[PDB]
Design an enzyme around this catalytic site. Structure first.
Site, PDB file in Angstrom:
ATOM      1  N   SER B  42      33.843  -5.250   2.321  1.00 39.40           N
ATOM      2  CA  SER B  42      34.476  -4.422   3.339  1.00 39.40           C
ATOM      3  C   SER B  42      33.683  -4.355   4.633  1.00 39.40           C
ATOM      4  CB  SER B  42      34.701  -3.008   2.798  1.00 39.40           C
ATOM      5  OG  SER B  42      33.481  -2.388   2.446  1.00 39.40           O
ATOM      6  N   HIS B 155      20.982 -11.251  -9.793  1.00 38.62           N
ATOM      7  CA  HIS B 155      21.839 -11.033 -10.948  1.00 38.62           C
ATOM      8  C   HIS B 155      21.072 -10.995 -12.259  1.00 38.62           C
ATOM      9  CE1 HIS B 155      24.895 -11.367  -8.086  1.00 38.62           C
ATOM     10  NE2 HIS B 155      25.160 -12.653  -8.189  1.00 38.62           N
ATOM     11  N   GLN B 163      20.003 -17.937  -7.460  1.00 38.61           N
ATOM     12  CA  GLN B 163      21.045 -17.033  -7.928  1.00 38.61           C
ATOM     13  C   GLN B 163      21.824 -17.641  -9.090  1.00 38.61           C
ATOM     14  OE1 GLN B 163      23.810 -15.847  -4.905  1.00 38.61           O
ATOM     15  NE2 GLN B 163      24.890 -14.467  -6.116  1.00 38.61           N
ATOM     16  N   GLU B 164      22.231 -18.909  -8.971  1.00 40.04           N
ATOM     17  CA  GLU B 164      23.088 -19.524  -9.980  1.00 40.04           C
ATOM     18  C   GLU B 164      22.606 -20.927 -10.321  1.00 40.04           C
ATOM     19  OE1 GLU B 164      27.124 -19.579  -8.661  1.00 40.04           O
ATOM     20  OE2 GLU B 164      27.011 -17.639  -7.636  1.00 40.04           O
ATOM     21  N   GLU B 205      30.415 -13.495 -13.697  1.00 36.00           N
ATOM     22  CA  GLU B 205      31.169 -14.737 -13.718  1.00 36.00           C
ATOM     23  C   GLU B 205      31.248 -15.359 -15.102  1.00 36.00           C
ATOM     24  OE1 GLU B 205      28.744 -14.345 -11.507  1.00 36.00           O
ATOM     25  OE2 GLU B 205      29.504 -14.504  -9.453  1.00 36.00           O
ATOM     26  N   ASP B 242      22.793 -22.632  -6.873  1.00 37.99           N
ATOM     27  CA  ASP B 242      23.165 -21.717  -5.801  1.00 37.99           C
ATOM     28  C   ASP B 242      21.924 -20.873  -5.576  1.00 37.99           C
ATOM     29  OD1 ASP B 242      24.333 -20.065  -3.919  1.00 37.99           O
ATOM     30  OD2 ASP B 242      25.545 -18.968  -5.373  1.00 37.99           O
ATOM     31  N   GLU B 291      23.323 -25.156  -3.044  1.00 35.47           N
ATOM     32  CA  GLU B 291      24.142 -24.267  -2.238  1.00 35.47           C
ATOM     33  C   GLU B 291      23.267 -23.159  -1.690  1.00 35.47           C
ATOM     34  OE1 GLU B 291      27.815 -23.054  -3.896  1.00 35.47           O
ATOM     35  OE2 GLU B 291      27.799 -21.111  -2.881  1.00 35.47           O
ATOM     36  N   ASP B 318      27.647 -21.553   1.942  1.00 35.15           N
ATOM     37  CA  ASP B 318      28.542 -20.457   1.550  1.00 35.15           C
ATOM     38  C   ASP B 318      28.466 -19.325   2.556  1.00 35.15           C
ATOM     39  OD1 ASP B 318      29.842 -18.238   0.223  1.00 35.15           O
ATOM     40  OD2 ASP B 318      28.064 -17.865  -0.986  1.00 35.15           O
ATOM     41  N   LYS B 343      36.365 -19.614   0.519  1.00 28.87           N
ATOM     42  CA  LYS B 343      36.837 -18.405  -0.136  1.00 28.87           C
ATOM     43  C   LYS B 343      38.012 -17.839   0.640  1.00 28.87           C
ATOM     44  CE  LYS B 343      32.372 -17.182  -2.201  1.00 28.87           C
ATOM     45  NZ  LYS B 343      31.123 -16.463  -1.753  1.00 28.87           N
ATOM     46  N   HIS B 371      35.585 -18.845  -6.235  1.00 27.49           N
ATOM     47  CA  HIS B 371      35.967 -17.559  -6.763  1.00 27.49           C
ATOM     48  C   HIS B 371      35.075 -16.459  -6.191  1.00 27.49           C
ATOM     49  CE1 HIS B 371      32.376 -18.547  -8.842  1.00 27.49           C
ATOM     50  NE2 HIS B 371      32.506 -17.633  -9.778  1.00 27.49           N
ATOM     51  N   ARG B 372      35.483 -15.220  -6.428  1.00 29.06           N
ATOM     52  CA  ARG B 372      34.707 -14.050  -6.054  1.00 29.06           C
ATOM     53  C   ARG B 372      34.166 -13.382  -7.310  1.00 29.06           C
ATOM     54  NH1 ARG B 372      34.843 -13.219  -0.563  1.00 29.06           N
ATOM     55  NH2 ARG B 372      32.892 -12.251  -1.260  1.00 29.06           N
ATOM     56  N   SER B 373      33.213 -12.465  -7.108  1.00 23.55           N
ATOM     57  CA  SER B 373      32.615 -11.752  -8.234  1.00 23.55           C
ATOM     58  C   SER B 373      33.640 -10.871  -8.938  1.00 23.55           C
ATOM     59  CB  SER B 373      31.427 -10.915  -7.759  1.00 23.55           C
ATOM     60  OG  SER B 373      31.849  -9.882  -6.886  1.00 23.55           O
ATOM     61  N   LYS B 394      34.883 -24.237  -7.926  1.00 19.72           N
ATOM     62  CA  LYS B 394      33.807 -23.380  -8.417  1.00 19.72           C
ATOM     63  C   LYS B 394      34.469 -22.059  -8.792  1.00 19.72           C
ATOM     64  CE  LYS B 394      29.718 -20.944  -6.897  1.00 19.72           C
ATOM     65  NZ  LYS B 394      30.152 -19.813  -6.035  1.00 19.72           N
TER      66      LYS B 394
END
Lengths: 130, 434, 105, 434, 434
Positions: B42, B155, B163-164, B205, B242, B291, B318, B343, B371-373, B394
């Site tokens: 937001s 995470h 991160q990933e 995810e 990522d 990424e 990203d 996205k 995708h989003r979380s 992804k």
């Protein structure tokens, strides 16, 4: 106890019309066209109070009161989906009806008509429109 | 007949239990479409923002009643009467109605939900598959998935900065085989972690977040899981990262501080030290994708990374680009990265999403639909990936239905295409030489 | 409005003249405003979203409206307003005597 | 027009990475229905078995190509030509074509997929909602959810013998409010577990499995989360338990050995001591549900537990009845339990599921429509719960789309029902006194 | 095309020659539905009241022009524009339009007629059978009929206090066989009465009202006729009673005075003595159902009777509950009766009738759909009985088409259901034990 005296009616009209509702741009919602008949009736009553006795002017004050109530109830201004009633706002914030209840002779009637003079004078002073 | 007669939003829940919205579009003949919005952010300086309620009494300030009201009272009056097949006209009308670059008045979630619902209703009316409606007649390429299998960074409690970690089954003949390989590697890793005594429960995810020793240990155990499943690393299954280096980047010192996630004694790496660290990781392990290996504002570092590793390793931006046409154009001009993560809710409109995909494709870049979380049961991004012939997706791990829904939709698309469907694998990495 | 309905010819005309793709928006005083300020006023509550827009204009003097039908008690179709239209001839008129009137040729 | 023209099955993935199947049904007018099957158990004495390939080289022996071929080459040739609105006739024809009590010849997964696909195609043909088609015109009652929030037993390494814990928002005015309460309590519990340093990753159902000290620790943390969210335990939100006592029941010694999960210091109870433990838990905490409180074969224990606690707490038979009409009737005869857990794939068809629901309703029992461990994006059990006016649903936690899809479907059903929608809450527990 | 466009009402005659009203509903596409209202009562403290003209010059004050005018001028304008499949919405709108708890303003008969006409027009529009529209896809149970054979009380001049005697062929394999058994027993009893010199003309309900000696003589003759037809009493055919104990209950003395109907030396029994007499009758004869065995306001006597005979004898409350939801709540809470007689015109709405049926079912009570004294050719109660799977109906004797219409409707429904159709018989008394 009277709300109108010779020492306060001009300042009373000052405060009464400085509190009138305003648009978001700052302009007054009241216009002189909405109170033209009331001003004319007050002027005629002041003119006739000099010659004739108060007992003759017993129906004129009542007609003036019913005109005040009718005009306050009928005049509406709609802006931005909001409806206000400027004449009723002026009547309640100036205590017009309560002052009309304290009219019992030539002196009080003339004081009330001078109070209406002061109300419209200061309304025009702060950007009131015709 | 195809005229939109009803546009109606309602507030539903996303995959994290947080509110989102869905939009239903009904046309005159009875064609129906439903678009569900993934949960984004937001607040954003140069990204589309979603309208949240902010009322702390309901849903911790995350209600979407304001965006639902914007759809029902503002967007519905404008859009009802449009032809359902006028996707571009409806999207431009919504963009003009919003009037702001970040879509903060109507809410990017509201506009995206109406866009997806309109596209699905038009596909229903025409009695064609959604990928056929979106991409035309020549829609045949099944995307190569980046299956997120190990989570670190912000995470995880593990001392891993990245991160990933992902597995790319690019050596499979079909998408069905690629999905089977990814599921089998996922289960083999689950067994390896259970034997090792590490945590097996999944995250946002669907991926694991164990207590590894570091990045190297995570990559070695991923390779061990691949070999336990019976596949050759570097030939059948590859590794992607990522890094999300913007999370552990010190902007004032201009240094990538690894101590944020890997304890006090972690090595503190500058721009060139990060460059050759990534090069050492690429040389040690079968890594095909990196990424967010640089900060979103380190343009010179991104250019140095593309000069060094761009010829053999896919570098995805990203956070670097944030699905923005201006940032992608700037990155193409300065030869920064060679891939963009797309996205849909970061730009808030299907027309602009396809514009970004086309601009990326024209420059030799690869567009990776992401995708989003917080996801939904809506699997439109699979249809977008097939429609654009992007060749790379992804959409998460092999655990939760928020991720499995897109894989199931891709299986359905492959079955519908039949003998025409093509899984290119390594040939879908056209941004790389050889 | 129950006795009549929207005609199919006017609906087709509006559909493929794309008049609903070119809406005009108004504020509470009935003044043309851009869609951005219309959205901003509707969100703020200063504009009623229902009666504040127009669907361009359809050309060609087509009848906008056609009679609506219903089922009579024996299952036959009938126009809604044909049979309850009137019951009395309203009496009237009045023949005013104006023989003294110079007419103009 | 409504004559079935095409029946086609394909293999997709569930919410665990394991394969399942989906069935599509097309009628002559273009009515379309899709049914996806949740993953069940291929081993069961009197529960319907699903057909798995058993090929260890493909998906670890969990492939569903045999059931897909059974639909495509056996069921399709038999069902094509039926009217799509003949759900009872199609289900009886499939049951006769199987010719096996536990549906082992064709697979219960294949039969259930065809049943769901046919019912959804019939609802699509009549242009009615699925709950209207299944349950008739008088379908209004939104179920009271038992949202699983904490795991144990075989789903956790904590010393908690009980399988899982649930929150029941039975004091909410609407289902929308109950969902909001459950989501807020879920987030409050997540924050509490973050403060205590316990694990945050979700399990199969979407619920946390932290390392609590014991059953009382978990229940007290649930109460703390309820009060932190701003709700009164025992008046707004209640607590349910799934003990799954069949896991820690020693058949030979006729004792409930908690030492299997709670360590060497756990108490080994008999049937009477187990009933006393459940009663003191009920008196200590606001517990309104106990599921599988006794063993599936301890009928004397079930009868004693119903005599003791059946007046004030709901006793659900999950492994006691295994969605079986014979077992449910036997339990009704001997006053064992007062609720049955209805699993649509444990019995095989929609007709038999509705028969079990109506038998339980006629006996004064409550029917709780339940999920499986491996779920899909299909949300038919929501329409089943609304259609039968069961008033209770058990569709998991607030953290995964395999569970959130059912909640979103219930939100949609409530929205379409509008002013006639009824959320009874505590009045949905009609098997209890006052 | 499903929008209601026309609602007409007209005044017709019932089975006794008294006026009633019928309603017809036309939708936009031409779907048609006709509802005929049975003759009820315009008086009652806690029951829905019908509206009558009160003009003593026309039909003795029994005209229904006021209700017809209400439908044509008040209900029709409110209901036209609704969707014909919005039965709950239409019914709630009409209940709100009345604005009176007993529907005295518009008239309960008018509201019930519009409800039935709307339901039948919706079933016609969907091209489905009425029971399928009312109860969904799982509608298979053909009700067991308790058919009147012998009358007494206030319907006969014999010294019999009990109002009705019925035969229940619960041992029949199908409903067709049960109907044949009932018709043959009816004819055999007719032959026996002719041989004995008693009367043969039938009453309002179609049953004989001969001049017997008492209750025992009547039941003995019924058993003799059952054996003469060739069926075993207590195995194939059972007896049932409608005592209507309110008619011979003295409220001042709190005693059941049989002297009102049985002569001058008739026994005068208290509540306990009445229970003893009913228990003696049940032990002596194969009586399976007793209806209104106590006064409508004798709650203590009802509770004691359900304690004594509630495990082996179905106890129906007709005047006890008056098919009122509140009285049924109080009875379920107080363990009074185990069955409710469901009359659709004592409520005035199909939605509330179905609400009462499922509420009774949830408590272990059986809903017995019943006819009125003055019936019509309309046979919607048969479709209601099949739709709810109630399994019990009480629609009169075998000698007038105000009852034969419902019997023929049930024959048609059984023919349409085919192999699916089920006649539970003795199993339909699920309110009993074993």
């Amino acid at each position: 106890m009277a709300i109108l005296t010779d020492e306060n009616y001009v300042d009373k009209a000052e405060r009464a019309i400085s509190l009138l509702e305003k648009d978001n741009k700052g302009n007054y919602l009241l216009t002189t066209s909405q109170i033209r008949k009331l001003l004319s009736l007050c002027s005629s009553l002041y003119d006739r109070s000099k010659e004739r006795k108060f007992d003759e002017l017993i129906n004129d004050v009542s007609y003036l009161r019913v005109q005040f109530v009718y005009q306050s109830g009928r005049n509406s201004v709609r802006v931005n989906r909001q409806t206000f009633f400027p004449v009723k706002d002026l009547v309640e914030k100036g205590q017009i009806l309560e002052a009309l209840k304290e009219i019992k002779d030539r002196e009080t009637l003339q004081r009330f008509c001078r109070y209406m003079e002061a109300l419209v004078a200061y309304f025009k002073f702060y950007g009131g429109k015709d | 007949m195809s005229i939109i007669t009803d546009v109606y939003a309602r507030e539903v829940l996303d995959s994290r239990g947080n509110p989102t919205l869905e939009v239903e579009v009904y046309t005159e003949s009875g064609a129906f479409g439903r678009g569900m919005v993934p949960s984004g952010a937001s607040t954003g300086e140069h990204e589309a923002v979603e309208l949240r309620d902010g009322d702390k009494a309901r849903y911790g300030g995350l209600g979407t009643q304001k965006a639902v009201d914007n759809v029902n009272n503002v967007i519905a009056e404008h859009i009802i009467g449009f032809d359902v097949r006028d996707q571009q006209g409806i999207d431009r009308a919504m963009i003009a109605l919003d009037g702001t670059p970040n879509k903060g008045k109507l809410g990017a979630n509201a506009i995206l939900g109406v866009s997806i619902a309109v596209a699905r209703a038009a596909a229903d009316y025409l009695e064609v598959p959604l990928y056929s409606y979106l991409g035309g007649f020549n829609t045949k390429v099944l995307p190569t998935p980046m299956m997120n299998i190990i989570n670190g960074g912000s995470h995880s409690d593990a001392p891993i900065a990245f991160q990933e970690f992902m597995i790319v089954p690019a050596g499979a003949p079909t998408f069905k085989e690629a999905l089977r390989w990814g599921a089998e590697i996922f289960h083999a890793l689950k067994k390896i972690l259970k034997e090792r005594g590490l945590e097996t429960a999944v995250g946002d995810e669907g991926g694991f977040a164990p207590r590894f020793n570091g990045t190297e240990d995570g990559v070695e155990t991923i390779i061990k899981a691949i070999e336990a499943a019976g596949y050759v690393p570097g030939k059948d299954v590859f590794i992607g990262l990522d890094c999300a280096s913007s999370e552990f980047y010190d902007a004032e010192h201009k240094v990538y501080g690894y101590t944020k996630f890997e304890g006090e004694g972690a090595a503190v790496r500058t721009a060139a030290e990060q460059i050759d660290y990534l090069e050492e990781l690429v040389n040690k392990y079968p890594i095909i994708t990196i990424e967010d290996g640089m900060d979103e504002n380190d343009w010179d570092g991104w250019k140095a990374l593309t000069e060094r590793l761009g010829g053999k390793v896919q570098l995805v931006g990203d956070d670097f680009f944030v699905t923005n046409t201006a940032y992608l154009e700037k990155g193409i001009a300065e030869h920064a990265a060679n891939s963009i993560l797309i996205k849909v809710n970061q730009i808030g409109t299907l027309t602009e999403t396809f514009d970004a995909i086309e601009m990326a494709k024209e420059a030799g870049y690869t567009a990776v639909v992401s995708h989003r979380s917080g996801e939904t049961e809506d699997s439109t991004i699979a249809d977008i990936a097939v429609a654009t012939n992007a060749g790379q997706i992804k959409t998460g791990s092999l655990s939760r239905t928020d991720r499995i829904a897109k894989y199931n939709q891709l299986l359905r698309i492959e079955d519908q295409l039949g003998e025409v469907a093509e899984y290119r694998g390594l040939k879908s990495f056209y941004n790389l030489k050889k | 409005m129950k006795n009549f309905k929207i005609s199919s010819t006017y609906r087709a005309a509006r559909k493929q003249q794309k008049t609903a793709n070119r809406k005009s928006f108004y504020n509470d005083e009935g003044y043309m405003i851009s869609p951005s300020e219309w959205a901003d006023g509707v969100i703020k509550g200063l504009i009623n979203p229902k009666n504040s827009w127009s669907n361009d204009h359809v050309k060609g003097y087509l009848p906008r409206v056609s009679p609506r039908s219903h089922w009579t008690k024996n299952g036959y179709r009938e126009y809604l307003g044909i049979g309850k239209s009137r019951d009395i001839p309203e009496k009237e008129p009045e023949v005013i005597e104006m023989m003294d009137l110079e007419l103009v040729v």
